[PDB]
Amino acid sequence: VRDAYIAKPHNCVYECARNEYCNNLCTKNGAKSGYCQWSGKYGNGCWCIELPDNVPIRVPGKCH
Ligand SMILES: [Cl-]
Known part of the structure; x- marks a missing residue:
């Protein structure tokens, strides 16, 4: 597990306005929680906090 920005295609973060939405997005994806x-x-x-190691996260580079 690791703490990080989960990515939506392709290498982009999931923009946000509230903690609840991220918590829902992170736990749907196996996280302990999120904000x-x-x-x-x-x-x-x-x-996301303690996201499984196989789920895509944002890495340096470009967001397409
Ligand atoms: Cl790692």
Whole structure:
């Protein structure tokens, strides 16, 4: 497991406005939970706590 921004295709974060939406998105994807980060490494986007290692996360580079 790891803590990170889960990615929607293709290498883009999931933009957000509330913690509840991210918590729902993160746990649907196997996380322990999640919240909206407005000023993290990629800026705005859902951040997930203890996401399974196989689920796609945002990595350096481009979002298509
Ligand atoms: Cl890791």
